[PDB]
Design an enzyme around this catalytic site. Structure first.
Site, PDB file in Angstrom:
ATOM      1  N   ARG A  12      -6.311  41.267 -67.794  1.00 30.84           N
ATOM      2  CA  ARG A  12      -6.816  42.470 -67.173  1.00 30.84           C
ATOM      3  C   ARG A  12      -5.865  43.648 -67.392  1.00 30.84           C
ATOM      4  NH1 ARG A  12     -11.610  42.792 -66.274  1.00 30.84           N
ATOM      5  NH2 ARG A  12     -11.157  44.463 -64.793  1.00 30.84           N
ATOM      6  N   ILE A  13      -4.546  43.438 -67.219  1.00 31.28           N
ATOM      7  CA  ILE A  13      -3.602  44.535 -67.350  1.00 31.28           C
ATOM      8  C   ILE A  13      -3.474  44.986 -68.800  1.00 31.28           C
ATOM      9  CG2 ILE A  13      -1.186  45.250 -67.051  1.00 31.28           C
ATOM     10  CD1 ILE A  13      -2.795  45.290 -64.468  1.00 31.28           C
ATOM     11  N   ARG A  78       0.698  32.878 -80.355  1.00 26.73           N
ATOM     12  CA  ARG A  78       1.118  32.480 -79.016  1.00 26.73           C
ATOM     13  C   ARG A  78       2.639  32.371 -78.900  1.00 26.73           C
ATOM     14  NH1 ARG A  78      -2.467  30.296 -75.233  1.00 26.73           N
ATOM     15  NH2 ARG A  78      -4.521  29.823 -76.128  1.00 26.73           N
ATOM     16  N   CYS A 149       1.831  46.233 -58.816  1.00 23.23           N
ATOM     17  CA  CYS A 149       0.929  47.274 -58.344  1.00 23.23           C
ATOM     18  C   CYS A 149       1.252  47.627 -56.899  1.00 23.23           C
ATOM     19  CB  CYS A 149      -0.542  46.872 -58.451  1.00 23.23           C
ATOM     20  SG  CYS A 149      -0.926  45.279 -57.689  1.00 23.23           S
ATOM     21  N   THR A 150       1.592  46.618 -56.085  1.00 21.76           N
ATOM     22  CA  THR A 150       1.922  46.837 -54.668  1.00 21.76           C
ATOM     23  C   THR A 150       3.142  47.759 -54.497  1.00 21.76           C
ATOM     24  OG1 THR A 150       0.996  44.720 -53.998  1.00 21.76           O
ATOM     25  CG2 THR A 150       2.571  45.659 -52.520  1.00 21.76           C
ATOM     26  N   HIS A 176      -4.736  43.061 -50.280  1.00 25.68           N
ATOM     27  CA  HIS A 176      -4.704  42.923 -51.719  1.00 25.68           C
ATOM     28  C   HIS A 176      -6.053  42.327 -52.178  1.00 25.68           C
ATOM     29  CE1 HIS A 176      -2.967  42.053 -55.690  1.00 25.68           C
ATOM     30  NE2 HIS A 176      -3.552  40.866 -55.553  1.00 25.68           N
ATOM     31  N   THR A 179     -10.496  39.581 -56.151  1.00 30.03           N
ATOM     32  CA  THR A 179     -11.574  38.985 -56.958  1.00 30.03           C
ATOM     33  C   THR A 179     -11.193  38.957 -58.450  1.00 30.03           C
ATOM     34  OG1 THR A 179     -13.088  39.618 -55.242  1.00 30.03           O
ATOM     35  CG2 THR A 179     -14.102  39.099 -57.403  1.00 30.03           C
ATOM     36  N   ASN A 180     -10.519  40.005 -58.988  1.00 27.96           N
ATOM     37  CA  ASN A 180     -10.158  40.019 -60.416  1.00 27.96           C
ATOM     38  C   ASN A 180      -8.719  39.553 -60.693  1.00 27.96           C
ATOM     39  OD1 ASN A 180     -12.425  40.820 -62.071  1.00 27.96           O
ATOM     40  ND2 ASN A 180     -12.125  42.958 -61.471  1.00 27.96           N
ATOM     41  N   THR A 201       5.515  38.116 -49.928  1.00 27.44           N
ATOM     42  CA  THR A 201       5.552  38.680 -51.269  1.00 27.44           C
ATOM     43  C   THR A 201       6.878  39.325 -51.639  1.00 27.44           C
ATOM     44  OG1 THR A 201       4.662  40.642 -50.361  1.00 27.44           O
ATOM     45  CG2 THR A 201       3.055  39.178 -51.348  1.00 27.44           C
TER      46      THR A 201
END
Lengths: 323, 323, 323, 323
Positions: A12-13, A78, A149-150, A176, A179-180, A201
């Site tokens: 995603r990032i 990889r 992100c936090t 937080h 779902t993704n 965290t």
């Protein structure tokens, strides 16, 4: 000449970093390394369940053509020791795989044309920077972390409010959205999709890396909730200086005009979480929900898209460290 | 003789109150008033998406038979002035419709055999009680409010912690699960199912009714989230007395053994929200996530089922006021 | 003497198989192999977001004690060639890891005391059986497959309806609930939690293994939806014999009284998906939604819990093959 | 001169109709009637959890300015007999309240300048039209219905496939996304957000209004699922003519080039439901999931946004009936 970057990893990032970087005229994405087949990678760039559709094409020679990056070489290796971004003359690697989140591991990228690595996650033993908070302390380190992100959401707010009122202590709760989200902690073994999940965290340690004076004065936790992308941070602060709702609002608004322009924003429109999907800000303050109690305590909430704000900062940091 | 109660309204709280009351040998449900047809009402008693299946039967004379309440008369009268619980000799009305949440409106129930009304919601101009917090201050009032699920969770914790450490100030955030939730506030016009929704909720005023000394020292808000039933309250407190994580844990545990036995519980098992569906407690403290910072500040979280804890307290209050 | 089984793997199906097997007096679970630490495994047995709480204890010697299985040895060996169930004298292995879904791979279990293996998934080159459909064709094979949850639901219905009316052709759509679901198919790369996802699933081939005459006459697909556990199969059938809604209802009801007693059920109560969480049936027919059109066509829907019906059949098959 | 329309009701369909109509140069929205305050209405036009942000302004005289409709009078009158669109000279009313879904009730709009009414729902005793299916049969009726989103998706497909292959019978299942959905049927009393909910929906009667020859040959049902907006129809058809997957694909593709251009589309990109949020098509065929079995049977699936396709057809019909 545009800064030559390569993106390692297309979760995603990495995908959000591709989209962001493609829109910046001072950046050239020269290469992407992905475990996906080429047409799968193209698909995932073009179509996103939360961020919508995006224009991308395949050139005749099977490089990608996206925005200002018209000749992107696609690799699929990889093994970091075999991976070779030299054919594309990459200068900065944006490290988005999650497999090399340490100074020692990501240093394996430093070979051939590559000068610098930015890790898109907290990383062991790695100099850490948050744009707008401590990025001007950068001093030519070749491997850095862009934190989480936090922390990108909370550290700007802490800095602003400490400068205005002097933080004595603060407690942070992050709601937080996971779902993704693709540990010694038994709750992580339970169903993310069906539950609110409280999680430690390492808030104090994270803040200490970018705001060393505040690290010892703050702590908190996260509550993982089954909605996508848009998260909220809730800061409960005790200050040395007396505050009102108005004075806190004014301190935050002034910062967004000046020192945090383009990084922190204010919502004066009484919006809800889905309105901030794909927002580029690190944090969007919920102006009407600021509150105080007693002379010295306040609560401040702020939204953020846990992919897009972060990814905009990732590319901001790439432009900055390239100078 | 068991206390003769009638339930007015068969939304979620009324249905939960039926289930709860049916299991208490010192209660007889003598009547239910519902807008549903009889077989629909029976269906909704027996089958629940979150609380599961429940045994209920229809007698030959078309009264209901549920637990210890074997002869429940079913009425269907919308007009409170026409509604007549006399045929069932009801003494206490549990008012669960949401249509009469004031002293003046619910006083229309006081006729014939009815002596008392408990409103299952905050209510204008109405003496308000939370079981375990201020219910022993009850002095034969004929119409009372059982407050909200949120206040039933937060007020016990505030009382315990104030008694131990002396609250100077506190900020409360409720993560309010609203999938099963059947204003001048524009955010209430937006889609509950797709959004996190911050909302003002009159925390200070609510606390002031049951803990008058604390009302002025506390404030907060809610964040509405699209999960069902199990909510969390997050209290950020500043105390006069110095605290540690351990000392806060011990104060809460001691209270659950004594003054709040059966009302507050402690989770030492590191569970997640779905584990507390149908819990009878007003609040279940998340023992491992208690934290402190500085000498005087703490964060305490607690779960609650926003229907079942509340409904267990509703019936506790009915037994109490009947004496 | 109870049948000595061992469960290999403690994902969702393995955990459900533990719970099921523990309630059967003719079964003794002698061993569980898990990648989890012992206390994590105990936690996951006791607490489930969809199936609720379950009683389990740790003995002094750190075996588990669950229902009728009072002395369960816990192993943690990833390598099938090193794994040794001999200390527990296991006779049948329930293979639930997903890592050995072939005849060749699961044959590595056949050593020492182990006589038979049941694979809890479709498996390459492996004799396949669905309880109630073709399990009486079993002929002492040492490695078998229990097919998929989807085939366990659809194959019983196809068999019943073919016997009654003679299937000429059928089209099957499964609405597959995948919140708790832990390929050349690009849609599998997209977010399960946010999307309806149509998927090919090899319906014709699956049916052909257990109902060879019908395999060539049926096909279909799945639509993956973001709800947990309870799925629906929708069969659209064309028959040789003329049918009515009533005659289809009667054929299904008669089968549940006789040949499919305990395997297929009928819902006459107009329930919804959450009412069938943890149901032990392979399929629960939605009686009121059966429909016909023309003389020869019908639509039949049926619910199933995609873990619990399947796991009840898994243990039924273990008891059967042990004889 | 642009066609002067007024929108009555600002629920989801009314808001989508505003957005659609504002982008058409041959339409002028002259008035909106809403129960919301003016600034609330503006908010709900600008901000949508699924359809995103939209430009709208308030003029100095407190009319709205949206796209090509620069002078929209805002009314707030609940009583249809008091409501007066004369000050805005409206010619066509788009009736979106849900309160007047009959010929008799909506005929109360026919006064003053108003010539025609289109009801955005099935309506008792009302001539019904689906654009692309039977709209050319329109013959100057002053009150019409645009049917349902479900019929707008299924009727085009039925028409295409009947013309190509001759439908003998068909069974339709709609997977109806109802997170944004604001009866003698007991399942409607259960929690939409937690359940799959099968529902009868009068498929045969609905089809009979727009395709009278097919009505008696088709039936079906809906399964309500807790996702937003994007629904799927699944048609299982038996034809007179022999079919293949290829021939069905080609028949659908040819229709989208010609008779159903702009109404039906084909997805050849293997997309998922969220990719079709805000799609303007009545139906988007899932090309790769078409299947056949035997010589004469096929299954065809198609997506639709249950607000936006419908609302695009609503405005298409307004332009058509104005001539």
């Amino acid at each position: 000449m545009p800064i030559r970057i390569a993106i390692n990893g297309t979760g995603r990032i990495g995908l959000c970093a591709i989209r962001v970087a493609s829109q910046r005229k001072d950046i050239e994405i020269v290469a992407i390394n992905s475990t996906a087949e080429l047409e799968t990678l193209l698909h995932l760039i073009r179509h996103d369940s939360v961020h919508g559709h995006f224009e991308a094409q395949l050139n005749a020679d099977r490089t990608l053509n996206i925005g200002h990056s018209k000749n992107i070489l696609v690799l699929s290796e990889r093994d970091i020791n075999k991976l070779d971004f030299s054919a594309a003359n990459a200068e900065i690697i944006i490290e988005c795989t999650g497999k090399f989140n340490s100074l020692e591991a990501s240093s394996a990228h430093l070979k051939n044309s590559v000068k610098k690595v930015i890790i898109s996650a907290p990383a062991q033993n790695t100099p850490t920077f948050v744009y707008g908070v401590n990025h001007k302390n950068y001093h030519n380190e070749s491997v850095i972390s862009n934190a989480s992100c936090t922390t990108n959401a909370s550290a700007p707010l802490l800095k602003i409010l400490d400068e205005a009122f002097k933080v004595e202590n603060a407690l942070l709760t992050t709601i937080h959205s996971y779902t993704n989200d693709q540990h010694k902690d038994i709750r992580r073994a339970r169903a993310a999709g069906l539950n609110l999940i409280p999680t430690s965290t390492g808030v104090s340690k994270a803040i200490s890396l970018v705001l060393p004076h505040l690290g010892p004065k703050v702590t908190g936790l996260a509550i993982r909730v089954p909605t996508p992308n848009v998260s909220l941070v809730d800061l409960s602060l005790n200050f040395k200086k007396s505050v009102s709702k108005a004075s806190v609002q004014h301190a935050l608004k002034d910062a967004c005009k000046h020192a945090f322009k383009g990084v922190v924003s204010i919502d004066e429109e009484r919006l809800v979480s889905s309105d901030f999907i794909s927002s580029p800000f690190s944090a969007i303050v919920i102006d009407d929900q600021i509150m105080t109690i007693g002379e010295k305590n306040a609560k401040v909430l702020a939204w953020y898209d846990n992919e897009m704000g972060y990814s905009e900062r990732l590319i901001d940091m790439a432009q900055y460290i390239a100078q």
